Write an enzyme that holds these catalytic residues in place. Sequence first.
Site, mmCIF file in Angstrom:
data_model
loop_
_atom_site.group_PDB
_atom_site.id
_atom_site.type_symbol
_atom_site.label_atom_id
_atom_site.label_comp_id
_atom_site.label_asym_id
_atom_site.label_seq_id
_atom_site.Cartn_x
_atom_site.Cartn_y
_atom_site.Cartn_z
ATOM 1 C CG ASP A 60 -8.622 -6.068 -10.402
ATOM 2 O OD1 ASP A 60 -7.513 -6.612 -10.556
ATOM 3 O OD2 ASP A 60 -8.925 -5.446 -9.351
ATOM 4 C CG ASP A 120 13.851 4.123 1.696
ATOM 5 O OD1 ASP A 120 13.133 3.556 2.545
ATOM 6 O OD2 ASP A 120 13.558 5.225 1.191
ATOM 7 C CG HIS A 173 -5.869 2.462 2.628
ATOM 8 N ND1 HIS A 173 -5.633 1.160 2.246
ATOM 9 C CD2 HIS A 173 -7.199 2.549 2.870
ATOM 10 C CE1 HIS A 173 -6.777 0.499 2.224
ATOM 11 N NE2 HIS A 173 -7.743 1.317 2.597
ATOM 12 C CG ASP A 213 -2.770 12.949 0.477
ATOM 13 O OD1 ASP A 213 -3.686 12.945 -0.361
ATOM 14 O OD2 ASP A 213 -2.261 13.990 0.951
ATOM 15 C CD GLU A 262 1.518 -3.550 -10.948
ATOM 16 O OE1 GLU A 262 1.323 -4.720 -11.340
ATOM 17 O OE2 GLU A 262 0.889 -2.566 -11.401
ATOM 18 C CD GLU A 321 -8.841 5.002 -11.423
ATOM 19 O OE1 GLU A 321 -7.594 5.075 -11.502
ATOM 20 O OE2 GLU A 321 -9.495 5.542 -10.511
ATOM 21 C CG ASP A 322 -11.865 -0.442 -8.458
ATOM 22 O OD1 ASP A 322 -11.549 -1.393 -9.215
ATOM 23 O OD2 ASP A 322 -11.666 -0.480 -7.220
ATOM 24 C CG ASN A 333 -13.075 0.021 -2.945
ATOM 25 O OD1 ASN A 333 -13.673 -0.706 -2.154
ATOM 26 N ND2 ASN A 333 -11.837 0.445 -2.733
ATOM 27 C CG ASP A 361 -2.877 -0.796 18.993
ATOM 28 O OD1 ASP A 361 -2.388 -1.224 20.064
ATOM 29 O OD2 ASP A 361 -4.058 -1.029 18.662
ATOM 30 C CB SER A 418 -9.584 -0.950 0.041
ATOM 31 O OG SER A 418 -10.646 -0.009 -0.039
ATOM 32 C CG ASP A 422 -2.266 0.642 0.996
ATOM 33 O OD1 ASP A 422 -2.261 1.857 0.708
ATOM 34 O OD2 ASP A 422 -3.325 -0.012 1.137
HETATM 35 C C1 LIG Z 1 2.468 -2.855 -19.823
HETATM 36 C C2 LIG Z 1 2.855 -2.355 -18.423
HETATM 37 O O1 LIG Z 1 4.029 -2.278 -18.077
HETATM 38 N N1 LIG Z 1 1.830 -2.027 -17.636
HETATM 39 C C3 LIG Z 1 2.056 -1.528 -16.263
HETATM 40 C C4 LIG Z 1 0.723 -1.402 -15.532
HETATM 41 C C5 LIG Z 1 0.131 -2.788 -15.276
HETATM 42 C C6 LIG Z 1 -1.196 -2.634 -14.522
HETATM 43 N N2 LIG Z 1 -1.022 -1.942 -13.210
HETATM 44 C C7 LIG Z 1 -2.327 -1.822 -12.514
HETATM 45 C C8 LIG Z 1 -2.231 -1.346 -11.166
HETATM 46 C C9 LIG Z 1 -2.504 -0.021 -10.884
HETATM 47 C C10 LIG Z 1 -2.418 0.438 -9.567
HETATM 48 O O2 LIG Z 1 -2.669 1.761 -9.358
HETATM 49 C C11 LIG Z 1 -2.948 2.258 -8.138
HETATM 50 C C12 LIG Z 1 -2.282 3.402 -7.736
HETATM 51 N N3 LIG Z 1 -2.593 3.935 -6.501
HETATM 52 C C13 LIG Z 1 -3.518 3.364 -5.721
HETATM 53 N N4 LIG Z 1 -3.826 3.923 -4.567
HETATM 54 C C14 LIG Z 1 -3.132 5.165 -4.200
HETATM 55 C C15 LIG Z 1 -4.108 6.139 -3.605
HETATM 56 N N5 LIG Z 1 -4.921 5.507 -2.562
HETATM 57 C C16 LIG Z 1 -5.675 6.570 -1.899
HETATM 58 C C17 LIG Z 1 -6.448 5.996 -0.735
HETATM 59 C C18 LIG Z 1 -7.062 7.122 0.088
HETATM 60 C C19 LIG Z 1 -8.101 7.928 -0.676
HETATM 61 C C20 LIG Z 1 -7.772 6.419 1.243
HETATM 62 O O3 LIG Z 1 -7.081 6.084 2.233
HETATM 63 O O4 LIG Z 1 -8.979 6.153 1.067
HETATM 64 C C21 LIG Z 1 -5.795 4.533 -3.225
HETATM 65 C C22 LIG Z 1 -4.949 3.397 -3.761
HETATM 66 N N6 LIG Z 1 -4.187 2.272 -6.114
HETATM 67 C C23 LIG Z 1 -3.919 1.693 -7.338
HETATM 68 N N7 LIG Z 1 -2.073 -0.372 -8.562
HETATM 69 C C24 LIG Z 1 -1.814 -1.675 -8.792
HETATM 70 C C25 LIG Z 1 -1.436 -2.466 -7.691
HETATM 71 C C26 LIG Z 1 -1.878 -2.179 -6.401
HETATM 72 C C27 LIG Z 1 -1.470 -2.961 -5.321
HETATM 73 CL CL1 LIG Z 1 -2.019 -2.613 -3.713
HETATM 74 C C28 LIG Z 1 -0.608 -4.036 -5.515
HETATM 75 C C29 LIG Z 1 -0.148 -4.314 -6.795
HETATM 76 CL CL2 LIG Z 1 0.965 -5.626 -7.055
HETATM 77 C C30 LIG Z 1 -0.558 -3.532 -7.873
HETATM 78 C C31 LIG Z 1 -1.887 -2.177 -10.099
HETATM 79 C C32 LIG Z 1 -0.416 -0.612 -13.441
HETATM 80 C C33 LIG Z 1 0.924 -0.692 -14.188
HETATM 81 CA CA LIG Z 2 -12.624 -3.086 -10.398
HETATM 82 CA CA LIG Z 3 -4.377 -2.272 20.946
HETATM 83 CA CA LIG Z 4 11.490 5.365 2.705
HETATM 84 NA NA NA Z 5 -9.632 -2.055 -7.062
#
Ligand SMILES: CC(=O)NC[C@H]1CC[N@H+](Cc2cc(Oc3cnc(N4CC[NH+](CC[C@@H](C)C(=O)[O-])CC4)nc3)nc(-c3cc(Cl)cc(Cl)c3)c2)CC1
Ligand SMILES: [Ca+2]
Ligand SMILES: [Ca+2]
Ligand SMILES: [Ca+2]
Ligand code: NA
Length: 471
Positions: free
Chosen positions: A197, A70, A85, A82, A127, A148-149, A186, A53, A259, A44
């Site tokens: 997905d 690192d 999570h 931000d 990843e 993206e959802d 989500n 905790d 999530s 994450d």
């Molecule tokens: C051909 C090539 O080379 N193709 C590279 C792509 C292949 C497909 N992949 C999809 C993918 C996008 C993504 O994109 C994101 C970016 N950022 C987030 N975030 C950040 C912001 N967050 C905010 C939460 C706040 C509002 C709250 O607390 O509510 C929400 C989650 N999520 C998904 N992740 C993942 C992923 C997530 C986890 Cl976990 C583990 C793994 Cl292995 C992969 C995968 C992207 C690169």
């Molecule tokens: Ca989805």
């Molecule tokens: Ca506790």
């Molecule tokens: Ca660091």
């Molecule tokens: Na998702």
Amino acid sequence: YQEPTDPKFPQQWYLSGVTQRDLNVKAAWAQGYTGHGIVVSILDDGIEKNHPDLAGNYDPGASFDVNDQDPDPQPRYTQMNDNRHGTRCAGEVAAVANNGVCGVGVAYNARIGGVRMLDGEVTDAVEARSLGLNPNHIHIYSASWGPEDDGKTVDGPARLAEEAFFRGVSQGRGGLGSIFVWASGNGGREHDSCNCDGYTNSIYTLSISSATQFGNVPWYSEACSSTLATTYSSGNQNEKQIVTTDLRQKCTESHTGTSASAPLAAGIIALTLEANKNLTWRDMQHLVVQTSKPAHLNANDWATNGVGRKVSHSYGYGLLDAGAMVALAQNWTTVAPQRKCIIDILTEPKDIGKRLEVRKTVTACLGEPNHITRLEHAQARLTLSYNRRGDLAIHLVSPMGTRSTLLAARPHDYSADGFNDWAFMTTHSWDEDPSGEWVLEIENTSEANNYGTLTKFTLVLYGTASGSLVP
Ligand SMILES: CC(=O)NC[C@H]1CC[N@H+](Cc2cc(Oc3cnc(N4CC[NH+](CC[C@@H](C)C(=O)[O-])CC4)nc3)nc(-c3cc(Cl)cc(Cl)c3)c2)CC1
Ligand SMILES: [Ca+2]
Ligand SMILES: [Ca+2]
Ligand SMILES: [Ca+2]
Ligand code: NA
Ligand SMILES: *[C@@H]1O[C@H](CO)[C@@H](O)[C@H](O)[C@H]1NC(C)=O
Ligand SMILES: [Cl-]
Ligand code: NA
Ligand code: NA
Ligand code: NA
């Protein structure tokens, strides 16, 4: 057994319920299972390793920072908080018990780390380096996010990340296989359909959806056939939410979404692995299939499959039951080696038009070392063109009559790019015999005169040929 004294444990209704609307975690604790010796990592935006905790269970060996390259996954602090999570998820798994702070983790004696990977550009390499972190130290990985959802994306692991999945399940954990727990998504309000997905749609991920406190399908849930089970999470404003550790050494009562469901499942899996450390990655999915509970989960699509189990596309096999998981784990017999039966179906490309049905009777590799009489996952790997992808709905019916939705209509998905060998996956025929007639249905759900062609349909069966229970 003495239950936890933490000030917010009474508010952790999905654990401490006396009403049967919970994950039955106290029963596992009372059997002696708390996660001791098990290592979980949260993939994450980082982990506040000094949280009061989390510090007592924090494991640097379960942690890394792939965004800045690192070892230290401490979050980047900002005015809007931000990057909180990962810290919330870490506490769901492994917040310390009986220390006067917040509540407790499901596996409150497990070791917990985090990969800081989402606070930056998420590339295939990022990843892969995250999924492949210290795979002979970390037992269980928890990932709450993916493509993206938005209800219009079709994407999954690119080459390095897929290689990381196969290396993980094959050689990870001393050859027993890394356990990858995933949130199914989500994207409910965008009418997302989660087999699009490729992370949650993978056979290598143990995929988890959500139920609200009153037992309903939350607004944010995505339905699909790849989901395996359910944990409680948030719902409407009369329903309680998830209570856990928060950034800046705080607690929260308002952790939400699918999530938030995946970490709870990861904790239950940690209790289960303590009960039997020799479980393979496939064993763990079998345990989930056999012990999860449909009761009191409301959905209009509960169907009984060919071995008598109720399954839903919203809930999989139902709510995880931690007491049942750890009880069944203890004497579990390791499943036989995984077989894979490949069946190329089409003799010619097929026009889709308004509706296409493809029927094929298969022997599931009779006479071969990949003969399967006991199915685990099944995939319909489809290559097709279509002028508007989201107008398609796709179903797959097994010989035993189980109708898996491979794809529901996605109104926002305007893509003209179709599906390029997309491996739609279903768990709903687990333990069925896959010999016999399979039926693929592709339908245009719109009144528009849409058009296209199915050029390849590979039916891929995984499973074994021994060890079945009476239905
Ligand atoms: C051909 C090539 O080379 N193709 C590279 C792509 C292949 C497909 N992949 C999809 C993918 C996008 C993504 O994109 C994101 C970016 N950022 C987030 N975030 C950040 C912001 N967050 C905010 C939460 C706040 C509002 C709250 O607390 O509510 C929400 C989650 N999520 C998904 N992740 C993942 C992923 C997530 C986890 Cl976990 C583990 C793994 Cl292995 C992969 C995968 C992207 C690169
Ligand atoms: Ca989805
Ligand atoms: Ca506790
Ligand atoms: Ca660091
Ligand atoms: Na998702
Ligand atoms: C783990 O399971 C394998 C496969 O059945 C078996 O050969 C091995 O002895 C088991 N190890 C332990 C420590 O139970
Ligand atoms: Cl394979
Ligand atoms: Na999965
Ligand atoms: Na049936
Ligand atoms: Na049959």
